[PDB]
Structure formats: structure tokens, C-alpha cells
Amino acid sequence: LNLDSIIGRLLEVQGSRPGKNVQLTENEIRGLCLKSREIFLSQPILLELEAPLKICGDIHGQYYDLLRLFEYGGFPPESNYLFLGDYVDRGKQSLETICLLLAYKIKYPENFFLLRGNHECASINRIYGFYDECKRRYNIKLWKTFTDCFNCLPIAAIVDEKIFCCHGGLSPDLQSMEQIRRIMRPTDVPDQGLLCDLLWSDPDKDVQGWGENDRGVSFTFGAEVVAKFLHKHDLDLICRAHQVVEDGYEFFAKRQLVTLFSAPNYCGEFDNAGAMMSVDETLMCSFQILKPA
Template sequence: MRRKERGADVIHTLPRKVIGGTHTTTHHNKSFIQSKSSGFVFNFYKPLPLTQFPFGRMDQSVLDDIIQRLLAVRGRPGKQVQLTEPEIKQLCLVSKEIFLQQPNLLEIEAPIKICGDIHGQYSDLLRLFEYGGLPPQANYLFLGDYVDRGKQSLETICLLLAYKIKYPNNFFLLRGNHECASINRIYGFYDECKRRFNVKLWKTFSDSFNCLPVAALIDEKILCMHGGLSPDLNNLDQIRNLRRPTDVPDSGLLCDLLWSDPCVDVKGWGMNDRGVSYTFGADIVTEFLEKHDLDLICRAHQVVEDGYEFFANRQLVTVFSAPNYCGEFDNAGAMMSVDETLMCSFQILKPAEKKSKANSGISLFGSTTTAKPGNTPAGIKQFMGGRA
């Protein structure tokens, strides 16, 4: 990868030293959850006409009006957007067809901006777009976990699906472990759909989620997924060949891509405290990158204090984009920008100051000092714990 440093944004040459731990929030054991719940390379800036996606043939003016209404609440955290049930269903149905027409392993060209977990924090999603540029000013890849935990999962997923429909070759969504009926039945999305609409609409979302792609490859060098690696992953064609639509199984490749975690205390593969999938050590990352001639693994799935964090001698990065996660943590959110030379920089969404009433519920943009390779910036603290 080519490397350089630039002014205000946080820019790191790749790879980079790990700067602390991860923080994760608690999931129930997956068996408990189940008992409780019922390639081609895309050419950017050349969106396909909507008529090429036959199901629904969503009218451009209808789509633009939906996007306009969803954006109209910028600067008003917590303000709900009034969409009709038919509008939301059409977003689900048309996006589902687009997901299925594109590969399970997306092959994407830089430049692109990569975002991690959003978890229904809609005002923070809008601020990410404010900072990175509204589509199609920039290309985006989201790594999953759009719903649950936050208060506005519906607004969040509807805007993301609308942009996917409007810019199918510029805007990409991967599946997270919360884009699964057995999970979002428990952690908030089901209840939000039922409260604001009905259970049938939740099932319509589930049908769309079952068609989401699960990984992306940027310029054949950066592999992206929500969770992590799998002991069953021997070649990338296995990802391409995963069938869709599908639910997320209890074990195996698809499960691991959405659920596994890196761990500094593990060599090889280890048990995962989540009760599902595995943890993997730095040796697994190094071996995988060398075998497949890759430079970096980019994933989400865990809360990190500064919104991003490196692992395995700078060969893996975790990106988390929901600041003040669940209103319980003081973490920042981050967005990783990959330029044409595959240089990566990080834009930071600062956590709100709890003591400031004026800033209550509002996260501010900013940046930290540029860090040279192998050096840990002053003031970075360990942030250990649980799951996203």
C-alpha cells in the first residue's frame, strides 16, 4: 500500500499498532435467543437505471421524496420520520432484488468510505453523511448492524436501503449479525416495527436482510466483513458461493463471518464468550493475509474507544461508527476513508460530553493527532470489555 500523511484527518499507514482493547456488550447465548424468537467489479459514479431492477420498478420521484423526508430531520436528534407502510415495503422489496443481483462477495474499487455498526443511532448516521458527503458525493460501504439497541432503527435502515436503490453501484451494505430475525427479534427492531407499524413489516425486513451480501473486497487488497475470519474459510470463492436468501446458521462460514472476533490473548482459534463462533489470534490474521495476497482485514462488531482500532501488527482494523453506544459508553465513532492509493484515514465522530446539557445527545466531529506507524498517540487508554 502507498502511504502518506495529511493534515486534519487521522491518517495511518497500514499496517499499524494495536492501540488498546475492545468493548463489547452482552448478547444472550444464541440457543437462548432461538428459543425466544419465533464477482464483478462495479464502475463507480455510473448508477444503473432503476428499471434494470424489475421487482417494483421504484419510481424515481417517489424514491427522492422518501430520501428528502428522511434527511429533513437533520439537526433534530430523535425526531421521527413519517413514512408509509407501502413505501417501506417497496424499499425492502426493491433492495432485496438488487442484493441478489450483486455478488455475495462484492468487488469494489477505491475510493470509498467504510462505516461500522450504526445500531439505530439515526442522528449519528446523518452526521456521518454530513462529514463524509451525501451520496453520490462519496462512495460508501457499511459493515452491518444497522438495527437494534438504538431508538431509530426504522429511519436508519430506510435511509440506507433508499440510497442502495438510488446508487446501487456506489453504495454498499453488508450483513451484520443483527440483520438476522432471531437476533433483532430480541434486541429492539421487532418491538420498534410492531409499535410503529406491525409484525408483518418486520418479516418483510427479514426477507430483505436474508439477501444481503456478507463480504467485500476493495481493489483485491482489503477484505471487509462484519465479524471476522472462519476456520472453514480456505478460499474466497467459498464466500461467493454462499447461497441466498438464507438465515444465519448456528455455525459454519456464514456464522463466523458475522460473529467471530479477534483476540490478543489467543493463538490460533479459541472459544468465544458470545456463545457462538470463535475468537482468532494474530497468527491467523497473518497466515490468512499471506495466503490470499491481501493487505488488510476491515471489520466492525465490537465497540472500540476511539471508533477504530488495529490488531495483529496493523493487519486488521475494527471500525465502529456509533458514538456513545447505547447511551452507556463514552466511545467515539469512526469512518475509514480509503483513497485511490489505498491509503486509509479516519474521520472521528466525537462522543457527547455527558456534563454538557447543550450538547446532550449530540456527537461532534473532530480528529485526533496523526500517529506514525508503530507509535501509540498520547492519551489513548485501554478500553476492555464486552460486545456489539
């Protein structure tokens, strides 16, 4: 497995008119899956990270938007990165997106981090495009290899004991951080409970406490929940993704929670910007925006 060769070929199409494919060999991709999976299992399921760090939300197979973000923020290892999940589905190049991300995780395991999103789950990505892309360009056995790798992704991260990061949000079952550490891998995403919620929940302005989620899974949670949570755990900010927002990032509960969404013009159905959030060594956060076409 020649990792630098793989990364070279993945980056080769930078500047090519968006949409040009990179076709690695099946063994190369299987190698990326198996090695990154080993690394995920060797590192905590609740990551504890230090700034400076750049944080990205949903990418959803928009490979060329990923390259634009890296181009501006600096290609690993120029800057440290944390991604909040949802690498595949919806977009046209899930494969190039997840391969490059896994390659960087393997090459720079202490400086590059990936959380699990609700689309890193076979029953979701079976339906929303990743299975189809694998079947078309490779075979469904490779898809099952991806699933085994996704099943080992870490679930949340705390940056400098102040920013709690996860893909979806809070859970009525989340009483102590140690509970996240009890989650066992490899695992699929259950249809309820703490793990489900961390990947599926949403904030909601009109709910006091916990409410029903129109998604038909998990919950919504209000500003008061966010406040009591931050106070109890001595945190300053929840940073999550999972929902498309017009300006790429969007605050909630007077800046106690931010939503990050990094895929501009999502699905070619929305006119949203994408955003990445940079956190410097003092924990001063700034936003870098990819405006829609």
C-alpha cells in the same frame, strides 16, 4: 414508489433536535425492502469494489449519528460508501436508519453498498429492539418483510484486491474466497459454519490460533491467523466491525486488522467514539472520528 420523496422526508429532520421521527407509509417501506432485495440478489455475495470508498461500522439505529457521518463524508453519491452491517437494534431510530440506507442502495446501486451484520437476523433483532420498533410504529408483518430483505444482504467485500471486509471476522472454514461465493441467498444466519463466523467471530490478543468466543457462538482468532490469511490471499488488511472500541477504530496484529465502530456513545452505555475509514485511490486510509458527548 417515489424514492426522491422518501429520501427528502428522511433528510428533512436533519438539524432537528436529535430523536425526531420520520413516519413513511407502510407501502413505501415495503417498496424499499422489496426493491433493495432485488438489487442485493443481482449483485455478488462477495463484492469486489474499487477505491475511493468510505467505510462505516455498526450504526445500530443511531440515525442522527449516521446523518453526521454523511454530512462530514459527503451525502451519496458525493462519496462511495460501504457499510459493514448492524444497522438496527439498540438505538432509538432503527427504522429511519435502515430506510435511508436502503433508499440510497436503490438510488445509487453501483456506488453504495451494505454488508450483512449479525443483527440483520430475525432471531437477534427480535430481541434487541428492531421487532419492538416495528411493532410499535408499524406492524410485525413489516418486520417480516425487513427480514426477507436482510436475508439477501451480501456477506463480504474485497476492496481493490487488498482489503477484505466483513462484519465479524475470519472462519476456520474459510480456505478459499470461492467458498463465500457458494453461500446461497436468501438465507438466515446458521448457528455455526462459514456464514455464521463471517458475521460473528472476533480477534483476540490472548489466543494463538482459534479459541472459544465468550459470545457463545463462533470463534475468536489470533494475530497469527490474521497474518497467514493475509499472506495466503495476498491481502494487506482485514476491516471488520462488530465490537465497540473506545476510539471508534482500533488496530490489531500490528495494523493487519482494524475494527470499525461508527455509533458514538453506543447504547448510551459506553463512552466510545465512533469512526469511519476513508480509503483513497492509492489505498491510503484515514479515520474520521465522531467524539462522544
